[PDB]
From a paper:
Heterotrimeric kinesin-2 (KIF3/KAP3 in mammals) is one of the most widely expressed and abundant kinesins functioning as a complex of heterodimeric KIF3 motor (KIF3A/KIF3B or KIF3A/KIF3C) and the armadillo repeat (ARM)–containing adaptor KAP3 (16–18). Notably, the tumor suppressor protein adenomatous polyposis coli (APC) has been identified as a KIF3/KAP3 cargo involved in RNA and vehicle transport crucial for neurons, accounting for ~12% of KIF3-associated organelles. Here, we present high-resolution cryo–electron microscopy structures of the heterotrimeric kinesin-2 complex (KIF3A/KIF3B/KAP3) bound to the cargo protein APC. Our findings reveal a previously uncharacterized KIF3 tail hook-like motif, termed the “HAC” domain, which mediates binding to both KAP3 adaptor and APC cargo.
Residue numbers in the entry:
A (entry chain D): 469 to 733
B (entry chain A): 569 to 629, 645 to 655
C (entry chain C): 129 to 688
D (entry chain B): 562 to 675
The structure:
């Protein structure tokens, strides 16, 4: 059934391309929901779907369609494909370039649900290998929007999208820690200010993400270190050392360690 | 409908008993002043149906015998 | 018999005919057996050299020629200076491979004799079974007897060279102890005793012990300590005494089953000291103390403790008994048949602190041994009034302290005896040494389960002394734990609760260290403050406020 | 009936509202040990329709706690001075057990027979 649905979807997308016909959109809706339902929690189904290169080649092109519901469904499908994927599936997902088309599409996404799906799929993919982080950092206007989701005022008061944005920023900040340009465009929007406040946040996931980012950015540069020193990060980073959650503890301790090595002299 | 009302009343009674017990525990642990201070740092999210506690990441929650020295 | 009084024409025949080598060796044995001929034999040059030369290869086939190895150099080896000539002629090194390949050939003989019984299916008194089997058995018996004697005298010369540290180090380099333990499997008294004396000589040093530990010795000596020869048991027991130091060897001893035979030897012999020392060393771990009481140690220890007439009873028996008393299974047997009464009588007829230690260790237990102690409070309390030095009063005091029966009313004891003023005086930091004061504190705690003494304790001014002691001895967790436990004792008796709450700052000192590093001190503080909170609401509010300023301390610091 | 059911459901919503308040406050600010202590102590009174506490001193199990074995880990309470004296001095006065230090059996003179 899964293979039959994937085959029908890929042949439809090949024989019609990017079309605005309503019936084709509804058929692709059915197919996408079917794949998301069928691939949920099935490693074998995920591997089978990721073995079909034509399927995901058809899928990635759908991100550029005018219907944002198609964007959201393709994002969910790529989410469940990238979640705990094996080496072959991760490499195959990287090959079809889903990262670039997903993250470009997020800039054009207007609906909250579609943006949540796309950013969550990016968060799942961003931990696979450093190449995904490279593609994320290489899109024009990429980091300037990644920082913009931290201060997102959600319509339904949900913290899913901000959690996704913090996770992506933590994942991709390793390359942000090596080049001055990315750090500069981060400073242009006062990213550290929104990162420090995330330590006091209502959600524990947000605190873990902020600790990871503070670990990554504060290392190996004087300017961000003294900027964090001016805003008093040392007090809240020291208070978070003994946390029960592993990621929070390591992030806070390491960030305080990097700040400690640069005391005024 | 009588059985439904009786079950609803029983649920009310159980919930009241449980929350009274919880207030008991909160009285023997947390003072009233800091019960009030805590209530100013918590918010209700109706969409998710759960509380929100700011700074949720800051809450509190030789005599062995050794005779090995004898040999050089 | 050919008795001679001269030399030559005897060592001359020792390198020209194999059958007469053995007769020449016997003649040399007879010549060297008496000591007055030793100097003449030594002065006979080229005599030991020829013996060594015929000795380097003729020790593998006849066995009877292996008599020629020693019994002449033996009497030389009884003197110190001849050891230099012994290293000159290198009898030790050749003796090494002598013993080694005799043991190898003994195992070879064992395996051929064992495999020669496989032909029992058809017995016909011929080469298949019997006949030649009888001949092999006979030559076996002769060869094994003579070779056992040869090993006996060879390792005898080995002991006579073992006095030197360097010579013993060279000997231990050659891996002696392996073949030494292998020779222990033989059945003949004298060679075994030489083996065990040699092994005891090596057993002081830890290098030879480490060469010993890999191969089991204790299992081989298990079936041998019931042997009939006195010097054998003496030196074997000394050897086990040297082997008890190592912990691993001692677990070997316990698991093999050496304890019953050790206790049997401790029954009644001339081996009291050595067997009892070994048994005491085995006792020094908690696991082996329990195996004693299973009809092994026997209550006879109490008997020879009761007989011994002197002002100071011997240290060994009292130490063994004290370490037996660490365990309830031994302690129940100790007090069987009301031995505790004569234990009192001995303890009190003279100042013997060691028996007091034994009965103190008896009294640390919940069982009926505690119940019997209720009758001795006056007899103990008489000597509590600082009468016989300090090393005596501590034991009596501590023995009384561990006597915690909630039904016993102590106020009679405190007013007749026990010197409540001296209890208060001892709490002064500058009064006495800290162990006595700590024992007094245990006393103050253990007199407080009785309500009648609550008013006395409240009036006596003991609480200020306890508080000053806690302030002056807050560093060590033992004093803090025990004083706070006295406070726990003494709060809920309705008379000292008021004093502690309202007159003294004790609950503040309980607040300060509610959550300390040690689990027990914190548990006692928690239970005492829980008991305080019910009768007093202000300290309850403070009890919440503190430890709320500690439970969420970083939280509050971040808000501030 | 519909109005009564709606009012009752509002009551349930507010009840679990404040119940979750208490649960979150406990799960963030109150340890598990003290929760267990108060849970063991407390008991509900049906006559007065409110929760009460059994006083410790008035509990039925008035059997009193058992004295600590040692705060330093020994078999009996032990002063620091006693531990120091155990370490330095051979005096059996400060020890519960293991009071005698036997010596290694020194090797005697080798003369037995034969």
């Amino acid at each position: 059934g899964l293979q039959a649905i994937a085959e029908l979807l890929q042949v439809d997308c090949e024989m019609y391309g990017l079309t605005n016909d309503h019936y084709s959109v509804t058929l692709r809706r059915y197919a996408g929901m079917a794949l998301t339902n069928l691939t949920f929690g099935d490693v074998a189904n995920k591997a089978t779907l990721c073995s079909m290169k034509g399927c995901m080649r058809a899928l990635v092109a759908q991100l550029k369609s005018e219907s944002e519901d198609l964007q959201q469904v393709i994002a969910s499908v790529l989410r469940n494909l990238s979640w705990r994927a094996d080496v072959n599936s991760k490499k195959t997902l990287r090959e079809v370039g889903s990262v670039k088309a997903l993250m470009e599409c997020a800039l054009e996404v207007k609906k909250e649900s579609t943006l949540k799906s796309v950013l969550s799929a990016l968060w799942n993919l961003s931990a696979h290998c450093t190449e995904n982080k490279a593609d994320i950092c290489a899109v024009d206007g990429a980091l300037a929007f990644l920082v913009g989701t931290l201060t997102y005022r959600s319509q339904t008061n949900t913290l899913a999208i901000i959690e996704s944005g913090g996770g992506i920023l933590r994942n991709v900040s390793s390359l942000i820690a090596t080049n001055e340009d990315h750090r500069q465009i981060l400073r242009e929007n006062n990213c550290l200010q929104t990162l420090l406040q995330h330590l006091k946040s209502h959600s524990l996931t947000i605190v873990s993400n902020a600790c990871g980012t503070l670990w990554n950015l504060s290392a190996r540069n004087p300017k961000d270190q003294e900027a964090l020193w001016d805003m008093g990060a040392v007090s809240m980073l020291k208070n978070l050392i003994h946390s029960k959650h592993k990621m929070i503890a390591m992030g806070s301790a390491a960030a305080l360690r990097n700040l400690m090595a640069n005391r005024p002299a | 409908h009588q059985r439904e009302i009786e079950g609803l009343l029983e649920n009310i009674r159980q919930l009241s008993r449980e929350l009274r017990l919880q207030m008991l525990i909160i009285d023997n642990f947390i003072p009233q002043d800091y019960q009030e201070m805590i209530e100013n740092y918590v918010h209700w999210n109706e969409d998710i149906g759960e509380w929100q506690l700011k700074c949720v990441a800051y809450t509190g929650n030789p005599f062995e015998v050794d005779l090995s020295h004898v040999y050089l | 018999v050919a008795n001679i009084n001269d030399m030559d024409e005897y060592i001359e025949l020792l390198y020209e005919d194999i059958p007469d080598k053995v007769r020449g060796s016997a003649l040399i044995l007879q010549l060297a057996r008496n000591p007055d001929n030793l100097e003449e034999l030594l002065l006979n040059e080229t005599a030991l050299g020829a013996l060594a030369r015929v000795l380097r290869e003729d020790w593998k086939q006849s066995v009877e020629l292996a008599t020629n190895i020693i019994y002449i150099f033996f009497c030389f080896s009884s003197f110190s200076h001849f050891h230099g000539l012994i290293t000159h002629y290198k009898i030790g090194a050749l003796c090494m491979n002598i013993i080694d390949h005799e043991l190898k050939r003994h195992e070879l003989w064992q395996e051929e004799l064992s495999k020669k019984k496989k032909a029992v299916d058809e017995d016909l008194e011929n080469q298949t079974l019997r006949k030649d089997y009888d001949k092999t058995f006979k030559k076996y018996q002769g060869l094994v007897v003579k070779q056992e004697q040869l090993l006996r005298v060879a390792l005898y010369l080995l002991l006579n060279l073992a006095e030197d540290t360097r010579t013993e180090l060279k000997m231990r380099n050659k891996n002696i102890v392996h073949m030494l333990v292998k020779a222990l499997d033989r059945d003949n008294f004298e060679l075994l005793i030489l083996v065990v004396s040699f092994l005891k000589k090596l057993s002081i040093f830890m290098e030879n012990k480490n060469d010993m530990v890999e191969m089991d010795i204790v299992e081989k000596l298990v079936k041998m300590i019931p042997c009939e020869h006195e010097d054998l048991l003496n030196i074997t027991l000394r050897l086990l005494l040297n082997l008890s130091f190592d912990t691993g060897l001692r677990n070997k001893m316990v698991q093999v089953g050496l304890l019953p035979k050790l206790t049997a030897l401790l029954g009644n012999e001339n081996y009291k000291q050595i067997a009892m020392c070994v048994l005491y060393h085995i006792s020094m771990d908690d696991r082996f103390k329990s195996m004693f009481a299973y009809t092994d140690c026997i209550p006879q220890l109490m008997k020879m403790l009761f007989e011994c007439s002197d002002e100071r009873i011997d240290l060994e028996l009292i130490s063994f008994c004290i370490n037996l008393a660490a365990n309830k299974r031994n302690v129940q047997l100790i007090c069987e048949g009301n031995g505790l009464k004569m234990l009192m009588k001995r303890a009190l007829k003279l100042k013997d602190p060691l028996l007091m230690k034994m009965i103190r260790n008896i009294s640390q237990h919940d069982g009926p041994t505690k119940n019997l102690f209720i009758d001795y409070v006056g007899d103990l309390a008489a000597q509590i009034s600082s009468d016989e030095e300090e090393e005596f009063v501590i034991e009596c005091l501590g023995t009384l302290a561990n006597l915690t029966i909630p039904d016993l009313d102590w106020e009679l004891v405190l007013k007749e005896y026990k010197l409540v003023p001296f209890l208060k005086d001892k709490l002064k930091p500058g009064a006495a040494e800290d162990d006595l004061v700590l024992e007094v504190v245990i006393m103050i705690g253990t007199v407080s389960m009785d309500d009648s003494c609550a008013a006395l304790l409240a009036k006596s001014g003991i609480i200020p002394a306890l508080i000053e002691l806690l302030n002056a001895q807050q560093e060590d967790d033992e004093f803090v734990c025990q004083i706070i436990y006295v406070f726990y004792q003494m709060v809920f008796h309705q008379a000292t609760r008021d004093v502690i709450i309202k007159e003294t700052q004790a609950p503040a000192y309980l607040i300060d260290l509610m959550h300390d590093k040690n689990n027990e001190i914190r548990k006692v503080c928690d239970n005492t403050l829980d008991i305080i909170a019910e009768y007093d609401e202000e300290w309850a509010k403070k009890i919440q406020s503190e430890k709320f300023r500690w439970h969420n301390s970083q939280w509050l610091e971040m808000v501030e | 009936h519909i109005k009564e059911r709606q009012e009752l459901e509002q009551t349930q919503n507010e009840l679990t509202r404040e119940l979750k308040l208490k649960h979150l406050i406990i799960e963030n600010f109150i340890p598990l040990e003290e929760k267990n202590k108060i849970m063991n102590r407390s008991f509900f009174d049906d006559e007065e329709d409110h929760w009460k506490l059994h006083p410790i001193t008035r509990l039925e199990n008035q059997q009193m706690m058992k004295r600590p074995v040692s705060a330093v880990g020994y078999k009996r309470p032990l002063s620091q001075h006693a531990r120091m004296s155990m370490m330095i001095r051979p005096e059996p006065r400060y020890r519960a057990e293991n009071i005698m230090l036997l010596e290694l059996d020194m090797p005697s003179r080798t003369t037995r027979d034969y």
